[PDB]
Design a protein around this ligand. Structure first.
Ligand SMILES: CN[C@@H]1COc2c(S(=O)(=O)NC(=O)Nc3c4c(cc5c3CCC5)CCC4)cnn2C1
Ligand SMILES: Nc1ncnc2c1ncn2[C@@H]1O[C@H](COP(=O)(O)OP(=O)(O)O)[C@@H](O)[C@H]1O
Ligand SMILES: [Mg+2]
Length: 471
């Protein structure tokens, strides 16, 4: 078992940072709890899927579980190997074997894979970010592989592993956004489903106090945040807390008095961009658009140079908080920022037509284009800064009109998880505060049905309904 201890030590080394102290627990609701009882029966479950909103903390949950297992505190008598598969890195088109996939996660270049697969009952895989798989993923592609040694396409390998036909006795855990279940239904095998909820108000304050190392700064920041309620109730998503606290730190550097007027998600992201920030921006948005359309999330130095980085602007300027270097490869800190920049790509004047963008919306192959549409809804409103002089004005009109038409076609129907749901058609309107546009769009709802499960849910529904009287 010497290699077992070596792998545990290497994993401890990798997942030590994010640090452990920074972790703030999030809620969970099984049956959709005890973290050590997830894989026990109440026969035994072999697949458990964690569903949650983007930015809710799926990846950090996976990394914390990794660290806990490495420390020997969690599943200490259940699993012997805990292989972290980052779905962002895995490529569907490329031909690879499961042995090579396992080797890609090990410390040394000579893993006893043959020894490892002797006891598959003590092996668990962590497919973190299923919606992040790039390219087209056929639901019924085959034939499904059987043995790890053999090499097949990424699609076949991933699907066969998911269908519990490759290493049948191995345990699996996939962390997916709920939008992607439409394609994950056909593959799952008697799955268990768990949900990540968000940050409670008490845990919101806890995070705000752990962010800072001095009492005065944390107290002032919390006081400023609480005094406005929309941002505070939208702060149950940890990524919003991260953005707001990082911006607060940036403002606190200088003597300027703190301030946060952000009312919507688009406003939050725009405030972040302004706080942390021409030739620099157009390439920054072209990179995001190309990555979204061409199914590229990680970009090589050559790719960065192609768009306009000009051998610079990323060593210091953009990497400050936007980009992140991984393993030559520079990605975006969070996919939401990439989608924000892709949406901005449609609203810069020196810009592909939005009609083709909307035509393929909610598709798994194209990345579901969800945050892109929401962010271009938010960014186009005329009511909403040095940046507003940059985004194109005339084109807005055209896209505005097209958006309206989209609404007209998407309300004469019903949908629950196929993506343009009534609630999601409303979230998009909420991002566009303009009263006139919201009224005209709401004019296309002869009947309304909505399922409400959070407080932001209730706020958005109430805002849409208030203008929905139809006069
Ligand atoms: C009725 N559909 C609503 C559609 O959305 C959403 C998701 S998600 O996968 O779309 N994720 C998000 O929408 N995340 C999100 C983010 C920010 C701010 C807000 C949300 C949702 C509440 C407000 C900033 C970072 C990501 C999950 N449930 N719902 C609710
Ligand atoms: N427990 C936590 N403590 C501190 N920050 C968190 C926590 N959970 C999530 N976050 C923040 O929320 C953001 C969500 O990103 P991440 O969880 O890595 O990916 P995903 O959005 O797929 O879950 C992160 O940038 C992180 O800073
Ligand atoms: Mg993630």
């Amino acid at each position: 078992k010497d290699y077992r201890k070596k792998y545990r030590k290497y994993v401890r080394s990798r997942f030590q940072c994010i640090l452990n102290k920074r972790y703030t627990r999030l809620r969970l609701i099984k049956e959709h709890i005890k973290m050590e009882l997830l894989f026990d029966p109440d026969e035994p479950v072999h697949t458990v899927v964690f569903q949650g909103a983007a930015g809710i903390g799926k990846t950090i949950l996976a990394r914390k579980m990794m660290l806990d297992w490495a420390s020997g505190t969690l599943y200490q008598d259940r699993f012997d190997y805990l292989f972290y598969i980052h779905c962002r890195e895995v490529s569907l088109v490329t031909q690879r074997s499961l042995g090579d996939l396992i080797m890609s996660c090990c410390p040394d270049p000579n893993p006893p894979i043959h020894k490892i697969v002797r006891k598959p009952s003590r092996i668990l895989f962590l497919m973190d970010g299923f919606d992040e798989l790039q390219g087209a993923f056929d639901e019924h592609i085959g034939p499904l592989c059987t043995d790890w040694q053999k090499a097949e396409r990424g699609d076949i390998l991933l699907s066969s592993l998911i269908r519990k036909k490759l290493l049948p006795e191995a345990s699996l855990l996939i962390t997916t956004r709920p939008v992607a279940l439409e394609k994950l239904q056909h593959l799952l095998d008697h799955p268990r489903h768990v949900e990540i909820l968000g940050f409670s108000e008490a845990k919101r304050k806890e995070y705000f106090f752990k962010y800072f190392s001095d009492e005065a700064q944390a107290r002032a920041a919390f006081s400023l945040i609480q005094e406005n309620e929309v941002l505070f109730t939208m702060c149950f998503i940890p990524l919003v807390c991260w953005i707001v606290c990082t911006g607060l730190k940036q403002q606190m550097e200088s003597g300027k008095s703190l301030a946060q007027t952000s009312k919507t998600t688009t406003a939050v992201y725009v405030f972040f961009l302004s706080s942390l920030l021409c030739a620099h921006l157009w390439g920054l948005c072209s990179l995001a658009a190309d990555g979204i359309w061409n199914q590229k999330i990680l970009f090589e130095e050559s790719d960065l140079r192609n768009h306009g980085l000009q051998k610079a602007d990323v060593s210091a300027f953009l990497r400050m908080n936007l980009f992140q270097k991984e393993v030559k490869f520079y990605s975006f800190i969070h996919m939401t920022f990439q989608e924000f920049f892709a949406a901005m790509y449609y609203l810069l004047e020196e810009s592909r037509d939005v009609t083709v963008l909307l035509e393929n919306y909610g598709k798994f192959e194209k990345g579901y284009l969800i945050f892109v549409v929401r962010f271009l809804f938010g960014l186009v409103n005329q009511e909403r800064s040095y940046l507003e002089k940059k985004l194109s004005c005339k084109i807005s009109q055209q896209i505005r009109l097209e958006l309206l038409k989209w609404i007209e076609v998407k309300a004469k129907a019903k949908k629950l998880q196929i993506q343009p749901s009534q609630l999601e058609l409303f979230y998009c309107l909420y991002e566009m505060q303009e009263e006139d546009f919201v009224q005209r769009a709401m004019d296309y709802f002869p009947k309304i049905e909505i399922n409400l499960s959070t407080r932001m849910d209730h706020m958005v529904s109430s805002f849409c309904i208030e203008n929905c009287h139809r006069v």
